[PDB]
Amino acid sequence: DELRQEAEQLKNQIRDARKACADATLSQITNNIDPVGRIQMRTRRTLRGHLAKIYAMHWGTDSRLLVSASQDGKLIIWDSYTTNKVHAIPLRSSWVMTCAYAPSGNYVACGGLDNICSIYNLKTRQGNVRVSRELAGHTGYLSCCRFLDDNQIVTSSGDTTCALWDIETGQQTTTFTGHTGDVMSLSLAPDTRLFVSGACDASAKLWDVREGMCRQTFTGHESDINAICFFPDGNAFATGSDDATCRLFDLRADQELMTYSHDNIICGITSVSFSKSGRLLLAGYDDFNCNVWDALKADRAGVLAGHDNRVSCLGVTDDGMAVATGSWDSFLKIWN
Amino acid sequence: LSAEDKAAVERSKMIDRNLREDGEKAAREVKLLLLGAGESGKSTIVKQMKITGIVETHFTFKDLHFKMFDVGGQRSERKKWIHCFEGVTAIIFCVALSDYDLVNRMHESMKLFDSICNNKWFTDTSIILFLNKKDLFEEKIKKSPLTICYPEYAGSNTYEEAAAYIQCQFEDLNKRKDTKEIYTHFTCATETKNVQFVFDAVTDVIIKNNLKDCGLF
């Protein structure tokens, strides 16, 4: 039509503007830096107690307590140092696809096929965990939830939208619309002023929390994006997709910088996380073996192979001391 | 070596004990995934039993607890969440027999059945197939020919021949004949018999699973 042409004309105009800046690749710049060498990580703790598939995990900001979600309707809070279960929360709906731990540590959230994000109060005058709030606006399953503070949470959903919620009032403060496909992951920026969401349209969109608009769209991936993680700097992020390829995108350059792919790897990526430095990219896979990538040289530093099933979730501690990989084999492992 | 950490260990053991007890209780439950390509027959296979995403229906028949998950409300990419029901005891599939002259819908149901039956997650999960609208089907076949949907149908426009043909057409869509079974029932007005059919099919599934676990197959 008169204005449908302009949509595909602007996309070319953007493609040209982001090609003028591609003077040198990231591989060229980091060609003379030294390789990280061979990363050998041994399993330190094995967290057992989940009867069914583990679907999500999140580390606490104190780098000791982690929450994990399983298809059995239990939300277990673990003490990584001693392998002790601090709390076990029975969920009303067992079909939980995501879990988050508050930065303060006072609340945990979970969601899934019920389309509800439930906030659980961990520190109560009684000794039980109680449901603080149940957020219900989403019309599709919740894929990811991330806390901003005690009173603010951002949740992605399978109805192609993302939302910012006020826990006190239970209302959607802001709704992020623009993804054509189901949104599968979120990553909050270190400043918490921006976040990225990866959806099933093979695009990653940068969203600012305060004014609710999409600043940038990244479309390198050839298949559904299942995992997204921000770089520790906050100026880049890495995505994981069903095409068995992880790639790194730069916010400032507005384009893909490098691609992490191997010929032996043909299965999708379920989880993506970065190390404290940002030098190592940790990606979960469906081959039952996690892979460690050199984020600067696109080399595979090492493999973490200790699960008999899909590594559905992955997280690195805020101090960078350990990485936790949860899996469909019902076990969480701590690697160091 | 420990102090108020022994008390923490005791708390951890008490709660993992509760987790083990809860797991045993869940294992006794029979979980059924209810599927279909509309609300044509799903509403009728949930009406008799007494107990937004997933609507769970809990009922008890013959001292056995059943949990039936209706996931029709989830308008989303099925391949992103279908793996959650990998360990379901059986799949209940509902097909309306009157949807062969309506639009395409019978073809759409066959496409859904073929997709669900041959997933990598349901390689060994048996399917309880319900053919609804038995009463309506005879009126349609005495009003219109069955060749509207299946052009290769040689037979009279009678209930038995046409319905047996449709049952064959659905039971011929499964490529995993070596690992799973399709239990076909024509939904009847006597609903004591639909629940009886589900109970019998589930009992057969449990017996086969037990034989697999015991190493006798």
Epitope: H87, G105, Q126, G127 | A3, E4, D5, E10, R11, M14
Partner: single-chain antibody, 232 residues
Framework: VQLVESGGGLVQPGGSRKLSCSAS????????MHWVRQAPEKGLEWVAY????????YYADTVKGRFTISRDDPKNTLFLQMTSLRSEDTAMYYC??????????????WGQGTTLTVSSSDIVMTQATSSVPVTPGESVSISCRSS???????????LYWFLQRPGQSPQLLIY???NLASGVPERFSGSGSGTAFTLTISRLEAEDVGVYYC?????????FGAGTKLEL
């Protein structure tokens, strides 16, 4: 949260008595419970402890073999059966709830107490001062000392601080040396070296006078200090 104690009265020496603590307003089954007596015009003394689930029971050497503590989770009641009572058992008995997990505040709630009147290796916690005259608005430091170091290998120094306001049950102020309890103003702060510890009140109020007790939770039996009195 409410703990109500019953069963007290005048008992002849050599007799028996049964004390009941009725828990209300919290998940009683998940909390470990303690009995703490306070003798007339004397300080706090730990008596017994029962874990959540009744798995672990501890008693003081004074009452070991005479007193038995039991729990009723369906009825939310804690019991102390006291046999062969002697006149040293005349005291105020307190029902205390304690939950143990990483980051828990043990000993956070205390009951109002029941009065029992019987007619006629352990770590020593030392509080040097018994009475401090104070005026509102100044900084007060309350010192406590321990026979053995309270710092454990895991990094936790188990020294709890309690305030007993006049005619009231003791209240938890600081847990594990530095952690401030829920609901307590930030005027209070605890710092210690592993064997010598101090409690600082930055600004006084009329609601801060009372006796301040230091307790160790490194090992059983739990021991208290003699108590430091703050007066106007």
């Amino acid at each position: 949260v409410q703990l109500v104690e019953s069963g007290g009265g005048l008992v002849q020496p050599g007799g028996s008595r049964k004390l009941s603590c009725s828990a209300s307003g919290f998940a009683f089954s998940s909390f470990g419970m303690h009995w703490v007596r306070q003798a007339p015009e004397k300080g706090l003394e730990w008596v017994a402890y029962i874990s959540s689930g009744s798995g672990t029971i501890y008693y003081a050497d004074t009452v070991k073999g005479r007193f038995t503590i039991s729990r009723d989770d369906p009825k939310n009641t804690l019991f102390l059966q006291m046999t062969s009572l002697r006149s040293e058992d005349t005291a105020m008995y307190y029902c205390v709830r304690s939950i143990y997990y990483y980051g828990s505040s043990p000993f956070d709630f205390w009951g109002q107490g029941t009065t029992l009147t019987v007619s006629s290796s352990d770590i020593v916690m030392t509080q040097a001062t018994s009475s401090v005259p104070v005026t509102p608005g100044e900084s007060v430091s309350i010192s406590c000392r321990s026979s053995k170091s309270l710092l454990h290998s895991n990094g936790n120094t188990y020294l709890y601080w309690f305030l007993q306001r006049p005619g009231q049950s003791p209240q938890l102020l600081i847990y594990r040396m530095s952690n401030l309890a829920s609901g307590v103003p930030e005027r209070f702060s605890g710092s210690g070296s592993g064997t010598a510890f101090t409690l600082t009140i930055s600004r006084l109020e009329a609601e801060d006078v009372g006796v301040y007790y230091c307790m160790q939770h490194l090992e059983y039996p739990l021991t208290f200090g003699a108590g430091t009195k703050l007066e106007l």
